[model samples]
Every structure is written in structure tokens, then in C-alpha cells.
Target: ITGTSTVGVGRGVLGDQKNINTTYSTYYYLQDNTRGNGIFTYDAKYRTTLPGSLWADADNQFFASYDAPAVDAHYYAGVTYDYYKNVHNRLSYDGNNAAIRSSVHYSQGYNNAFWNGSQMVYGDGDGQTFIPLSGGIDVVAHELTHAVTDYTAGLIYQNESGAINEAISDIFGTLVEFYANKNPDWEIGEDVYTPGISGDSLRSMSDPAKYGDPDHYSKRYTGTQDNGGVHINSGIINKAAYLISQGGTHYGVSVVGIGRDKLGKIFYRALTQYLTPTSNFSQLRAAAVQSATDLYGSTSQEVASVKQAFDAVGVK
Candidate 1:
């Protein structure tokens, strides 16, 4: 959709007002040409398909109930793109200004969202388990970070490697949540996870065990379910990451917090430079330690914290 760039007012899944970048063709298209190559969102029309039709609006205003998910999906993609470029100095997920694409309303009663190796897909949950996934910026960022991981570490999505992949997404998603500074918390997908429950979230980085996710390696799931418990066991890595940034005592081990900037630098370096496709938890610990050493040196507290964080989680 080639058209002049424009800004449109819209309310997203949570009914919060925000301005979204749009294109003024025959109609306002949810095709933002302002970032990287571009950020395009599609409407899945309650069907399972790849990127559906480009979201088009008769007017620049998007307030319809059906427009909620599309609005958030498109807007959050831009925010995630900005985080990579401004904070990490990465061009895009591919570091080549590749266009960011997403689709919303995928299948009725669908309860999840994911990166389908090419584009982001969101489901308009049955409203019991979830509302609209894109409503949570963390969810959007979490999915987009999968694209980032694919282009960088290419972490194999199985066993420990898969757990690492999921943790990476959760880490960056929480970082982006903090970056956005909108009622930020260390929890993942709190805003749109449950409307029936309050003061709870899908998972907690500050305390993964709060949601029955294992926060220690000894407690890691060994079953074949969930791709070797990719989502469940990621709690171990997520907790280590949280400790590295915020500092905490886990399993009687105390880690001095190094803060988020150092956390981002260390993890980003590890992912883009030290990590490989089949890297496991032990390898990840080594990579993170080396990454911190590269950034702040052998005697640096940053390096020490990275090691302690991993040790606190029994990753060693």
C-alpha cells in the first residue's frame, strides 16, 4: 500500500487511546512506513491464515471493537522496532531493515500468539482465557523477539535450547515493557492475560515460581510435553536474568544487581555473538559470563553478577 504517511487516532484492545501510524491510500491502511522498511498489520478475519488483508479503515479513526487487536498489533510492532534500533543499534529483527508483519484475529477462541518464522500472528482469545493478545505490548514484543532470536542465535526450539529461546523472548519483552514505562512490571502478559482474575499474570520474571514455573534447574521439567517444557522450564533462565538486572537472593545465593542496561548489553552480546543453534543452559551460562567480561572486563562486577545469577539458578 503505497501512500502518504499519516497518523491516525485509535483505541487499542484495552480501550486505551493512542495514535497509530497509517498510510493514506484510498483508505487509512495499518501500514506504517515510518520505521525500517515498514510495519504492516493484517486482519485474520477469525480464520487461520498467513498475513491476511492489510488492515484498512474508511476513516483515519479506528474505534470499532474489531479494530482493537489490529491497532495494538501494528502500534506495538513499531515500538519493538524502535527498541532494537535505538537501544541495541540493530536495524530490524534481521538487522537489515526487513519489514515487520503481523496478523490479528486468527481463529475464533484462539488463546495464544506466536512468531510463525515469518510474521507475528495474534488470536482474539475466546475472552475467557484471553481478550486480544496484542493488547499486551509484552506479548507483542515477546513474539517479535522470537524473530530477533531466529535472525541472531537461531536457538533450536527444543529442550534446553527451546527454553532459552522462550526466556530470551520473555526477557526482552519485560525490558520493552519497562522501556515503555506504562504501569511496568516484571510480570509477562498481565494486561491482557486475564480479565477475570486480578493482580496476577501469565508468568512472573521476578518470581517465576509464583505461576508454578520452575525457578531452579533442579526443578526443571524433564518430560517431552511442551517441547521439553520450553515454556515451563524457561523460568530458570528468566529468574537468572531478573537477578542479573534487579539483584536477588535465590536458593540462598545472593547476586548483586547490575541493572538493565548491563543486562541488555550482556545478553544481546551473548545472543548475537557467543550463542549457537544448539546452545544449552550450561553453554548459555558460559556465553553470558563471557559476554559480560567482554563488556566490562574480568574484574567487572557485571561479569561477576552474570555468573552469580546463573549459579543462583543452578545453571552451572
Candidate 2:
């Protein structure tokens, strides 16, 4: 839509007030053309249809209760775009500044969000399990990172490769949360997950086993369900990533903390350069070690820590 870019005040799903970028034609629309090509968010109206409608408001102020999800979805997408451009020196998910798009209120009692190989879709959870998922910045970034992985690594969504795919999303999702510096921690979906239960999250990178996810390769699920336990097995890699960033010991193996920035650099390089669609846990270990060696020296602590982190998770 041909319109002038403007800022609008709105409250997110968590009641956090922030300014959102909007475009005005006849009515104010949730289309932000300020970054890259654009970042557009739409309302799903509790239906299954996608990209339901370009959210429109008579006034630029988006304080209506119904507008909460759209506000967060639009704002968080911009934050994710900024994260890639500023931190990773990458364009949009496609590396060509592709327009980012999202749809919220996907379906009644919907409990998850995902990237449909193109745009992002969020569910207004059953309220017991979740609220509007877009409220969680990590969740938003997690879904968008799937697009990034699809464009770069193209990691197959099954078996070990699929676990790597899921772990990559969790890694960058936590990194993006840390980048924003808003109650940053290693927990995923803590803010919007299980509101009734405090101090609990959907998953934990610091201690994946806290949620019954395996933190070591020996305990990995080898079942036929869940695309060979992609989400279940991702805990192994997620634990390794956390150890690389924060330093830890597990099962008598120890890792030296190299910090988050370097950890992100190494993983990003591996994802964009060394990883293949069918890469397994062993292959991912090799890729991370090589990546750390390329960024730091072969004899550097960064490299040693990369090796130790994977070893701690029994990836080798």
C-alpha cells in the first residue's frame, strides 16, 4: 500500500507498551516499510486462513484489546530483522532483504507457532497452555530463525538434521532475547508459556533435562515419532550451545565459556558455511569446531571450548 510511515502507540499481549511502525493509506495498516523491504503483520481473526487481513485501525493508536497480538508481532519482527542485520551482518532471512510477514490469532485455542517456509504464523493459545504467542519475543524470533535456516543451511527437518534445525532456532532465539536485553535468560518461551505455573518454560537451554529433554546424546530419543524426535533430541545441541556460551560441566566433561557473541559467530558461520541438509550430530560437532577454528585460532580456547562443549553433550 502506498502510504507514509508513522509510529503508533500500542500495548502488547503482555501489557507492555511500545511504539509500532504503521503505514497510513485510507486507514492505518500494520505495514512497516522502514526496514529492508517491509515488515507486515496481519490479523487471523481466530480462523485458519493465513495472512487473514492487513490489520487496520481508524486511528493510529492500537490500544484495543484485539490489537495486542498484531502489535507484538509487527514490533518483534522488526526487532528480529534488526538482530540479523546488526549482529550477523545478514540481510533478511533470504539475505536479500525479503519482506517479513506474520499472522496472529491463527485459530482458537491454538497452542503453537511456526514458519510455513515463507511467512510466520502464531496461535492464540488455549490460555491454559499459552496466550497470544507473539507476546514472547523469543518465540517470534524462533519462528523467524527457521526461515533463516531454511535459506542458509537448508537442514532437513528429520532425524539428526531436524534436531539441528530446532536447536538452531532455539540458539538464535535466545541470542535475540539477549540482544534485546529484556529479562534475558536461557529459557525459551518463559514469558508466554504456562502463565499459571511460574519459573517454568516450554524448554530450557541452560538445563534441557529440566523439562525432560535430553542434554546428552546417549539419552536421545530414537523413536519414529516427531520426525525422529527432532524437538526431543534438539536438547542435546541446545545444551551444548548453552555450555559454549556460559561454561558448564556435565557427566565429568567441562567447557570454558567463550561468551555469547563468539558463540553466535561460530554457529552462524557453521550454519551458513559448513552445515549440509543432512548433517548429523557428529557432523555438527565437526562444523562447530571448524567454525570456531576459523573465527579464532585452531589452538585458541574458543576452539578447545567448542570441542569440549560438544563432548560434554556426548555429540562426539
Candidate 3:
């Protein structure tokens, strides 16, 4: 919708105050025109319907408790967009400045969120399991990164390829969190997960095994559930990615830390330049190694660290 650009202030689910980009015609709407074409957010109003209604306010103020999810969803989508453009020189999720859209407060007691192959969707969790999921920056970034993967490698959503796709989202989601530098860590959904339990997250990149996820290739699940264990088996790749960014000794094998920037560069290069729809763990290792070799020389420590990280994770 064409309207005058404006700014709105709001407090999010976690009580963090921030500014959101909005558009004003008759009423202020949660439509940001500053980035790409636009970043629009909507309200689901506890129904299964999608992209329900464009959030509107009379005064461009969004401090109500009900507005918390929309606030975070809008703000975090901008942050993720900035991360991609600034860090990777990419326009948007599709590298085409695609309009970003999100819907919050989806379905009563819904405990999950997804990209749905188009726009971002969030659920107001059943209070006990999660609060509004958009409250978590990492969660928002994780969902958006799925669209990124779709545009890039187009990894198949089953078996090893699906696990790779899931790991890529976790990896970049953690990167976007660190890019924002707001109490960042290698944990996924830590902020909006299990409000009743502290220090727990949906998954752990640093130590996937901490949350019953495989930290090594040998431990990967071979089940038919979860789309061939996409979520469960991503731990193997997540562990490798964490080791690359922060060196560690796992299962008596060691990896030398290569820092986050190089880790991101290599992975981004691999995802855009090398990976395929059917890429598996071994192929991912090769792609990462080649990406490191392309960014740094094959003889460079960066390349060696990539090799060692996968080796430490038993990917070889």
C-alpha cells in the first residue's frame, strides 16, 4: 500500500524497547518501506488463516501487550534483511529485494513457526512451551533463512539434504543473532522457547548433543519421522559449523577455530556456489573445503580448519 513512511516505538514480548518502520495513510500500518520494496507484518488473530490483516494503529504507538509479537516480527525482519545485505551483499532472501512479509499471533496455542515457502509465520505458543515466537530474533532469522536456502542451493526437503537445509538455517540464524550483537550465542530459539524453563533452547549449535541431537555423523538418526529426521539429524552439521567458528575437542578429535566471519564466508560461498539439491554430509564437507579454498588458499589455515572441523564431526 502506498503511504507516507513513519516510525513507531514499541516494547516487545521480552520487554525490549525498539523502533519499527511503519506506513501512514488514514491509520499507521506495520508496513516498512525503507528496506527492499517493503517489510510488512500482519495479525493472525488466533486463527489458521494467513497474512490476516495488516496491523493498524491510530497513533503509530504499539505498546499494547497484544502488539508485542508484531513489533518483534517487524523489527527482526529488518535486522535480518540488513544482515544479508551488509554481510553477504545479497539483496533479500532471493537476492532480488523481495518484499518480506510476516504474520504473528497465528492460531490459538500454536507452538511452531515456519517460512511456508513464501512469507514468515509465527505462533503464539501455549505460554508454557513458548511465548510469541517472534519474540526471539534467532527464531525469526531461522525461518527467513529457509527462504534463502530455497533460492540458493534448493536443497531437497528430505533425508540428508533436508538435514543440510535445516543446519544451514540454524547456522545463519545464529550468525544473524551475533551480527545484531544482542547477548548472542550458538543456541536456536533460546529467547522464545520454554518460558517456564530457563537456559533451554530448541537446539544447540555449540553442543547439539546437549539437546538430544547428534553431534557426530555416526549418531545421526535414520528414522522416517520428521521428514527423514531433518530437525534431528541437522545436529551433525550444526556441530561442525559451531566447531568451525569456535574450535573445540569433540570425541577426542580437535578443530582450530577460524572465527565467525570466515565461517560465514565459507558457508555462504558453499551454499551459493557449490551445494546441490541432493548434497549430503560428505558433499557438504567437500563444498565447505572448496569454499574455504576459494576464499582463502587451499594451504591457508582457514581451509585447514574447515577440513578439521568436518573431520572432528566424523563427516569424513
Candidate 4:
């Protein structure tokens, strides 16, 4: 409201100027790069001043020396922007006309990518282990979703909150990838890592247990590892959403099913509608169930599956 004085009254929802901007802003291309990184950073920075700094190795060997990884990153960002705008009728991260900004080539052989407060930051991966993290669409979506989480719920990056935070990113990231029609199998981080490495992605949506890790959450959900293990324990919520959306047996049990587009709408609704900064695992489960009911019906199998998946993951 304060920042969007000329955004036009009755044009959008109240107390959600940012959301309106985010929804609309995802339609236009940033022209920063031929790739997806530019769009990702643009969505991240929307109203912020940060440049989304690029730190690439002077050698420039990571992302196909012929082309810059930022180009790919920028391209995918536009794809993500188009997805929300055309499919969900959302603006940008905050749902207003937020300007997306991103920086490419961050850190030489940097092994990870991240959303640093207001923009997306990518790194050139170690050639032996990983390549440029921005080469993949899901990675770009993952970073953009982080900004969405920060702007909407601002969930605490600790314990269950942290897991939910990670889960939100994974959910949207996977959706963006699928929307692109690049891969509907719903695998995360398949492109950034080297073929030489055995395990590439940080998580898997179709089958979390395939990574040979536990699916349900553990007490050690948060610790001084990988940003409070936000990237690790996220498996629980990610798996739950995947199970509900894909409509499959969770650990071998009947569960309600919903399409990816519907699931995305519900999750975004819950994040922007009922979640708060202090919202935790239980709060997230309840909010998602409420969102499912609102979007579908209170007694719909969709809501039941969402709640049942949460229960299966031991969220209660």
C-alpha cells in the first residue's frame, strides 16, 4: 500500500499489494540474459536495491564456456514468471508489479546456489562434483521460491519452520520445472551436479527415499548444518505435497490426489493467507489443510489427502 501508491485501488486485494505485484510482474522478460538466471534474480529483488551480484571464475569454464550461465538462469526466470501469470494469475513474489533482479557467476567453483535476502545468487560448481548451479530450471525456481517464502510467511529458518521453508521452495521449484515441460518426473537438482557424482540433487519429490535417506522427519530436524538443515529435513513436507498432488500411496496407504497446478494454488494461498513468521510444522499442516478445503471442499478428498499426507509424515 505504502510503496504501491499508484497501483490502482480495487485493482487488487487489500493488505496484499506485494502479492499483486508479484503475480503481474512474472509476465515480462527482464532482458538481462538469454537464460533464466536474470528472471530469477528479478523476481527476488522486485522492490529491493541489491544488484544480485555475480561472482564467476575468470576462467569461465563451468556453464558451457560458449554461453553464460546467467543467460540460462534469466531464461528460466521468465518461464517461471510466465507460469504464475498465465496459469495462476499471480503478479510476482508479493503479487504486485515487483522488479526481478539477479546476479550471475557468484564465487569460483561455489558449490551451491541461494536467495540472499532480496535476490538470487548462483555459483560455478566444482567441475569434478558439480557445474554451474544455474544451468537447471528447478534450481532457478528453487531460489525464486525462497524469495516467495521470505515475502509471504517469512518462516523461521529453524526446526520445523526451516523444514517448511525448504519444502515451500522445493514445491514451487518442482512446479516451475514441470510447467516448463522439461521433466514431469519431478526430480530436483538433476542438471547442476556432475555425472561423475553418485547423488546429485539435494532432494527428490517423486521418491524421497530413493536418495537412500529417511522420508519422515526426525528430531534432529534442525542443526548447524546446511542452513539449519533446511535443505535436508525438507524431505518430509516435500514428500507429503508430492504424495498428495501425485495421488499415490504414502508408505503404502490410500491418499487423496490433486493436480500440480491445484496444489500450487493451495500452497500459495496458504502461504499468503494464513501463515505467519512464527508458523511451524503443525501450523503449516493445518494451514495447508485449510487452504485445500477453501480451494476444493471441506470434505473433499483433496483436503483429506493433504491432511493424511501430513499425518503420514508424522507432522501431528
lDDT of 1 by residue, 3-111 (tens): 9999999999999999999999899999998898999999989889778899999999999999999999999999999999999999889999999999999999999
Flag regions of model 2 displaced more than 4 Å.
Answer: none
For candidate 3, the 10 contiguous residues with the lowest summed lDDT are 304-313
Compared with the true structure, all predictions reach lDDT values of 0.94, 0.94, 0.94, 0.66
Look at candidate 2 and tell me the lDDT of residue 161. Answer: 100
- How much is the lDDT of residue 27 in candidate 2? 97
What local lDDT score does residue 126 receive in model 3, on the 0 to 100 scale?
Answer: 95
Q: Give every collision pair in model 2.
A: none
**Backbone clash count, each prediction separately:** 0, 0, 0, 41
Candidate 1 residue 114 C-alpha distance from true site, Å: 0.4
TM-score of each: 0.99, 0.99, 0.99, 0.78
Q: State candidate 3's TM-score.
A: 0.99
